[PDB]
Amino acid sequence: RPANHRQLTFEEIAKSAKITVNEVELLVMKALSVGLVKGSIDEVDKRVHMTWVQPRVLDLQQIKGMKDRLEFWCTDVKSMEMLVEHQAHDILT
Amino acid sequence: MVLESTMVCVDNSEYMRNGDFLPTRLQAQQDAVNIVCHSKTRSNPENNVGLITLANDCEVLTTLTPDTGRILSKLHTVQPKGKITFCTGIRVAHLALKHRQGKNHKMRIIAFVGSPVEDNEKDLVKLAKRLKKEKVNVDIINFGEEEVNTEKLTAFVNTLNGKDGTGSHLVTVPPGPSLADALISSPILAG
Amino acid sequence: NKQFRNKVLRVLVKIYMNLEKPDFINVCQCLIFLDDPQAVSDILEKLVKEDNLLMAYQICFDLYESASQQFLSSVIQNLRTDQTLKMIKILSGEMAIELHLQFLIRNNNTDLMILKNTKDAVRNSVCHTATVIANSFMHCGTTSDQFLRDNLEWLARATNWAKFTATASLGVIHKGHEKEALQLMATYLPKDTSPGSAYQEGGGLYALGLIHANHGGDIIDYLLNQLKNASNDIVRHGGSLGLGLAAMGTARQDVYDLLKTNLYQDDAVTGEAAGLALGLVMLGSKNAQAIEDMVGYAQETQHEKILRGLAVGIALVMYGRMEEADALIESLCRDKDPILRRSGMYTVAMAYCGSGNNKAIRRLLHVAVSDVNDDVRRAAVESLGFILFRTPEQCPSVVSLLSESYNPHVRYGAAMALGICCAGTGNKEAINLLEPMTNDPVNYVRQGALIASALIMIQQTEITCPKVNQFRQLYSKVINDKHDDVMAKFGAILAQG
Amino acid sequence: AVQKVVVHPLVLLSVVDHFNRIGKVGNQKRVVGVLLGSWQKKVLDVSNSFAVPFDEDDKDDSVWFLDHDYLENMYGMFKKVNARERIVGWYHTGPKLHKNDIAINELMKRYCPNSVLVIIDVKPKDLGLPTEAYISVEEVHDDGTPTSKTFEHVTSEIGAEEAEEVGVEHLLRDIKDTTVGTLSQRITNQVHGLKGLNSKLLDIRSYLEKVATGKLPINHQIIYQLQDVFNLLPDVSLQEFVKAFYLKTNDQMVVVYLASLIRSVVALHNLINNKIANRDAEKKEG
Amino acid sequence: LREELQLLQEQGSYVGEVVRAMDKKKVLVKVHPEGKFVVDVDKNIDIN
Amino acid sequence: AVDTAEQVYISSLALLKMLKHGRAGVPMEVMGLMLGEFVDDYTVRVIDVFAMPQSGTGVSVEAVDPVFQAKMLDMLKQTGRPEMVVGWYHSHPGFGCWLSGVDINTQQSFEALSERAVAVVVDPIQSVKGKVVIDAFRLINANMMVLGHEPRQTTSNLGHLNKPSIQALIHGLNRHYYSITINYRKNELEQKMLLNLHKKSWMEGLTLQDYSEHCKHNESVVKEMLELAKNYNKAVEEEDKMTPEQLAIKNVGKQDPKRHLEEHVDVLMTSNIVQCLAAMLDTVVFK
Ligand SMILES: [Zn+2]
């Protein structure tokens, strides 16, 4: 998911892993012991709140969209910061 | 006296570990280093002589110096196992000759080839015309077993210099049992 | 701007020619304003066609006096293509030199007592140039000099550049007198007897260059041959200065060439020599390859004097250019070289001389604010006297606080600015602001206060301003007082000159 | 091992002035010398250095040599005059190291247990703090290849102590100092921001260019994991990031409230006292 | 400030007491923590 | 014989070795040697500076090691430029860097061998940043007692060198000695990069890192110092509200003001760091 929006629900894990609702505790918390996620579990609605993530692979056409996520950060900082000192360029001299 | 810097090249190729030269080529070329370092000592005091390993990776363990003591120490336990490499063996000593502080010393290299080489004739003629542009005079003495009456090396020395240039001389081991001192007896009297 | 100015001016002298009463002061105004080479040849050809003699005498001398040398070269070029010898006499200005010589020898009013009180001081520092340059001023053009007779042991104290200036004053006091100036100096001639004083023989040709400035004669080539002879670089110091100063404004060609092969002799003190010489010969020419070679030689050279000589050199080549020079002024000011920035200061000064435009004061005053080098900042605030000299009254008001600055360099150059700008006026405000300047603890700011205070009082007697005799007695006082600094007291005897 | 190194302006100039030494005679290759380090702790410091004549053939691009007698007796010279100084490695002007630079460190590993090589830059252009630092280490690989040496990058910082501060701090004579609070932080917002834009831009340009040309490979010893680390955080709301928004708004509350407080205090004092001394000076003199 | 902060270290400064003055223009003064000195004018304030 | 105004062209590498060799010996005075070339009388240049080893005899004419000079000049011969020696220098970290009796005792030897041999002294102590400090000395010829002792001509650099007049005990050496002028020649490219090298302090380490480290902390524990700044708000401004009432009692200014001015305006300049760098989050978080 683009997310985050890192908070999941019990229905998502129990339907995907096709395991009972009592064993999803052992499921997600063992992954906390593996080290792939540090997240916490909200047991009122039985939701699961993930934190960070464990990077594994990725793919082609991802270096392109990576340049899109980058160049957008490029024109963001360029525009706004060039607007900042555009105001105060006069008073400097 | 004559001004020049002589760079001696020992042959570390795996074919140089045999005892055909009595008692062993290790001590035979050691005496060869003994006679070239003592002759250049009796020639000019300003001559500085280092050593270079031609086979496998080329590394000079003894920086160019007139004292041969550290060179004599590297002659022992040299571990001369490897495949002979020619084209780089001359140029590695050429770079050591470009590090000389004084520029009045002529560039001179002496090397020993005791092993059959895979170097193509195009590579040695490119080094020949390169040494023609760089003026370097190299005097090679062929030891060990190789092609009978070495040609590509003889043509290498021939095409290396000309007019005169007095000069590059090649001494090939004769096809017969002899001591290493008898092989180096000719070059020490006349190049 | 000069765009529509001369276009309105050119028709007004034509309506004066169509007017019944001819008046030469209006064509005199356009001669010094419109300043075009063909117009003076047109109006004077109409004077020769009119057979005018008596009343053309005015406008003809206004042409010699108030117009450029190339303006004289242009009018003589189209004219010569009684009155034929008259135009030679009026354009050469020899009669003006002879009457000036007779005016100076007959009417000379001097006082030797002050020169003797400065003589017997005999201070070994900085006094070498002091007395000789001061009495060379007051006595200019007399040719009667008794100085080496009245002061002797003081001149025997001379060493190094002292004998340069000593024989250089020989030319300052002999200024004018174009004829006998060469042969009358035979005793003081630039020997070149080789117990080497050689700055001596360099200053001798310097003296011959001070007299031969503006117009001249074969003596220019006489110094040129001696530049190609004798020794080096000691001859080039005052000799090439003589070669360039005599050709000043004449747009001489060969001097630019033989000074390039002379520039390549690779020495230091001769740097200012060829720099000022090449800058004087190219004055007003706004050439291309001259500045290109001067800016091309400044790299491989290790000397800062060749940088300063070429600084004023490329500054002097451009005079009255206004916005035409700003293309180069932008490059000289934007550069990080302080000497080249100071070069652009003298360049923008001579280009904006006479104009009060605020385009110059933009960058000129900007580098006078934000720059970290006090010397070029000093030359920046000195240009106020060059460009604003037409309106001296406002300078004491705008530079009022600018003489209160912490560094003495700004207080100095500003004191020189107020001195040279208001010099032609009797304004008491400049003298009021210069009163605390001579009270400043720093030495050379008092010195510049002494020189500038003598510049405001020029020809002005006690009835003009009350501070005349007060400063006159203050000059002899500080120079006769050993406790005061030698630097600050140098401008005292200088002020007396 | 070696974490960070402190490169003083003295050692950098000691390479660059030798770039004038052999640069006036030229021509190609680079300026190589022996680096004199000072190790007080895990953080490395550099004080002095010395340069040795060096030439490298291209033929034979792997051939390199240095003068050991120069390294020996001059170390005996510099250790004599200063007992605290010793060689921590070597250096070169790059700009980018050729593959042959490894064996130089392997030869001088007999002098020092760990020799850190410092790439430098004689002509400042881009992108930031000059030079570079590489430490000699054997990382093997996750692919279990026979152990090879790929030098790990050591972060380099510029510093000084006392006298080295005196020289350069007077030598600036260029820009205002600092000035604290006004121009300082905002120019850093331009430099660190914009140089961060073109950094990753050209670096992501190399990311795609290496995939387009240069394979093998470079994809993926680290490509797959590093690029996923880029995909770790997109990172936008909902939800808690919306809470951080107006919480940050609640953070600017106090400071701008204090701002209005200083406005009232500064305006009160200055305006009242100035008008007092103003009206008094006018009514008394006039 | 820096100039007087430069002036005052290479020397220091103290306060004396004149016990006599000299015909040579010198003055008899003590360095009070130590033995006495005898110094001379000091051209601003005269002997009288 | 002929004397003219002198100028010392120095290289930044020379000044670096100067203060570096002087800082490593503090407090103890060290002994170096000056290296360069004599172009003429009125101009001189020092293109290199090397340090002599410290010995037991202390600072003395015998402290110069001849075999060190022979091997150094040999090491300079294999170095790119083997220029000839010129003069000597010794640091004085512990005092006002004035020439002692041993300094002139080695000066007649350096003037014997070398014609000029300008003596230079340098100290770190005087100024930490904004002064040239260092020093300059040249021994006047005692054989000149016949002629006058007061050259030079072109007094520009001379009269400007004398100022401050350098105390008393230093200008007490102005008899029998005289200083010499020093200017910094460019070499602008290296001077500009080394300028930015120390600017890494107040600007940023990489010109990126340190104020991206200001993006690391970034209000973080930086509000703790804002809490101490707002404690300086309460502290300083609770006695600042007592000031204007007292001004009405004493009628009025006691000159004064207490200052007790500016201050937290700079804290609001850190609030400009707050608004700017946090406004970067909209650029950081989104794409
Ligand atoms: Zn001492």
Alpha carbons B42 and C152: distance in angstroms, whole number: 74
Type of residue numbered B49: V
Q: Which two tokens stand for residue F258?
A: 């207490």
Alpha carbons E9 and F97: distance in angstroms, whole number: 12
- Rounded to 10°, the helix C56-66/C24-31 angle is 20
Q: Which two tokens stand for residue F282?
A: 């909209």
DSSP single-letter state for residue C142: -
Residue D47 to residue F207, Cβ atoms within 8 A:
no
Residue D226 and residue F242 in contact, taking contact as beta carbons nearer than 8 Å:
no
Q: Which run of H or of E encompasses B142? A: strand B137-142
Query: Which chain F residues are closer than 8 Å to C165 by Cβ?
Result: none
* Whole-number Cα distances in Å, B168 to B6, B91, B161: 13, 16, 7
Alpha carbons B108 and B8: distance in angstroms, whole number: 9
Type of residue numbered C263: L
Residue C314 and residue C345 in contact, taking contact as beta carbons nearer than 8 Å:
no
Type of residue numbered B190: A
* Whole-number Cα distances in Å, F269 to A82, C128, D179: 19, 59, 11
> First vs last Cα of chain A: how many Å apart?
49
F106 Cα–ligand 1 center, Å = 10
Q: Is the dihedral of CA C285, C289, C292, C294 positive or negative?
A: negative
F103 Cα–ligand 1 center, Å = 6
Alpha carbons C100 and C98: distance in angstroms, whole number: 5
Residue F11 and residue D17 in contact, taking contact as beta carbons nearer than 8 Å:
yes
Q: Which run of H or of E encompasses D182? A: none
Mutate to test the interface with F, among A4, A67, A70, A73 (most CBs of F within 10 A): A73
Q: What is the CA A7 to chain-centroid distance, rounded?
A: 10
* Whole-number Cα distances in Å, F170 to F88, F98, F100, F121, F179: 19, 6, 11, 12, 10
* β-sheet with D4-7: strand ranges across: D152-153, D134-135, D116-119, D86-92, D32-39, D44-51, D4-7, D155-158
* Whole-number Cα distances in Å, C14 to C19, C24, C43, C44, C71: 9, 12, 10, 14, 20
Q: Which two tokens stand for residue C38?
A: 């063909």
Distance of residue A82 Cα from the nearest chain F Cα, in angstroms = 12
Pairing of strands E36-40, E18-21: unpaired
| Residue of A73, D193, D166, A76 whose CA lies nearest to F207 | D193
Residue C293 and residue C274 in contact, taking contact as beta carbons nearer than 8 Å:
no
Residues sharing a CB contact under 8 Å with residue C482, sequence separation 6 or more, in sequence order = C123
Neighbours of C308 (CB within 10 A): 17
Range list of H helices, D131-182: 163-171
| Structural Rg of chain A based on CA atoms | 21
Alpha carbons C46 and F282: distance in angstroms, whole number: 82
Please confirm whether the linkage preceding F164 is cis (ω < 30° from 0): yes
Query: Which chain C residues are closer than 8 Å to F42 by Cβ?
Result: 268-269
Map residue E37 onto helix, strand or coil.
Answer: strand
- Subunits next to D (3 or more Cβ pairs <8 Å) are A, B, F
Cα-Cα-Cα-Cα torsion A63, A66, A68, A72, nearest 10 degrees, comes to -150
- Rounded to 10°, the helix F224-240/D240-285 angle is 30
Residue E11 and residue F96 in contact, taking contact as beta carbons nearer than 8 Å:
no
The data reach a resolution, in angstroms, of 7.0
F73 Cα–ligand 1 center, Å = 25
Alpha carbons D226 and C97: distance in angstroms, whole number: 90
| Residue of F51, F50, F45 whose CA lies nearest to F10 | F45
> First vs last Cα of chain F: how many Å apart?
77
Q: Is C413 exposed, middle or buried (0-12, 13-18, 19+ CB in 10 A)?
A: buried
C-alpha angle D272/D274/D275, rounded to 5°? 65
Alpha carbons D66 and B91: distance in angstroms, whole number: 16
| Residue of B175, B140, B153 whose CA lies nearest to B32 | B140
Q: Which run of H or of E encompasses D100? A: none
- Rounded to 10°, the helix C374-387/C408-421 angle is 10
Distance of residue B7 Cα from the nearest chain F Cα, in angstroms = 19
Residue F151 to residue C160, Cβ atoms within 8 A:
yes
Alpha carbons D248 and D101: distance in angstroms, whole number: 51
Type of residue numbered B111: A
Pairing of strands F32-37, F43-51: antiparallel
Alpha carbons F16 and D16: distance in angstroms, whole number: 13
Alpha carbons B2 and F32: distance in angstroms, whole number: 39
Residue B46 and residue B87 in contact, taking contact as beta carbons nearer than 8 Å:
no
Range list of H helices, chain F: 12-23, 66-78, 101-105, 107-113, 156-162, 188-202, 209-213, 224-240, 243-250, 265-285
Q: How was this structure obtained?
A: cryo-EM
Alpha carbons F69 and F85: distance in angstroms, whole number: 9
Alpha carbons E40 and E22: distance in angstroms, whole number: 8
Own/partner long-range contacts of C398-404 (Cβ < 8 Å, ≥24 apart): C399/C433, C400/C433, C403/C433, C403/C436, C403/C437
Alpha carbons D47 and D11: distance in angstroms, whole number: 7
- Rounded to 10°, the helix C289-297/C270-281 angle is 170
Alpha carbons C224 and C309: distance in angstroms, whole number: 19
Q: Which two tokens stand for residue B122?
A: 């195009």
A65 and chain D in contact, CB less than 8 A: no
Alpha carbons C360 and C349: distance in angstroms, whole number: 8
Residue E11 to residue F167, Cβ atoms within 8 A:
yes
DSSP string, C11-72: HHHHHHHSSSS--HHHHHHHHTTT--HHHHHHHHHHHHHTT--TTHHHHHHHHHHHS-HHHH
Alpha carbons F279 and A77: distance in angstroms, whole number: 10
Q: B138 has which bridge partners?
A: B109
- Subunits next to C (3 or more Cβ pairs <8 Å) are F
Cα-Cα-Cα-Cα torsion C360, C365, C371, C377, nearest 10 degrees, comes to 90
CA atoms within 13 A on the CB side of B2: 11
Residue F181 and residue D168 in contact, taking contact as beta carbons nearer than 8 Å:
no
| Residue of B113, B134, B126, B94 whose CA lies nearest to B54 | B113
Residue B141 and residue B114 in contact, taking contact as beta carbons nearer than 8 Å:
no
- Rounded to 10°, the helix C486-496/C112-119 angle is 160
CA atoms within 13 A on the CB side of F183: 17
DSSP single-letter state for residue D67: -
Distance of residue F34 Cα from the nearest chain C Cα, in angstroms = 21
Residues sharing a CB contact under 8 Å with residue F199, sequence separation 6 or more, in sequence order = D172, D175
Q: Is the dihedral of CA D53, D57, D61, D63 positive or negative?
A: negative
| Residue of F123, F98, F138 whose CA lies nearest to F7 | F138
| Residue of C139, C135, C64, C70 whose CA lies nearest to C95 | C64
Neighbours of C274 (CB within 10 A): 29
Q: What is the CA E32 to chain-centroid distance, rounded?
A: 12
Alpha carbons A70 and B24: distance in angstroms, whole number: 68
Neighbours of F12 (CB within 10 A): 22
Distance of residue D158 Cα from the nearest chain F Cα, in angstroms = 6
Residue B97 and residue B136 in contact, taking contact as beta carbons nearer than 8 Å:
yes
* Whole-number Cα distances in Å, F38 to B31, F44, F108: 52, 5, 19
Alpha carbons B137 and B105: distance in angstroms, whole number: 12
Helix, strand, coil percentages (3-state) for chain A, rounded to 5, are 55, 10, 40
Residue F21 and residue D47 in contact, taking contact as beta carbons nearer than 8 Å:
no
Map residue F49 onto helix, strand or coil.
Answer: strand
Alpha carbons F253 and F247: distance in angstroms, whole number: 6
F169 and chain E in contact, CB less than 8 A: yes
Chains F vs D: touching, with 3+ CB pairs under 8 Å? yes
Alpha carbons D227 and D224: distance in angstroms, whole number: 5
Residues sharing a CB contact under 8 Å with residue F282, sequence separation 6 or more, in sequence order = A76
Residue F169 to residue E7, Cβ atoms within 8 A:
no
Query: If you measure CA to CA, which chain C residue comes closest to F163?
Result: C442
Note the maximum CA span of chain D.
96
Cα-Cα-Cα-Cα torsion D193, D196, D201, D205, nearest 10 degrees, comes to 170
C-alpha angle E32/E36/E39, rounded to 5°? 110
Q: Which run of H or of E encompasses D91? A: strand D86-92
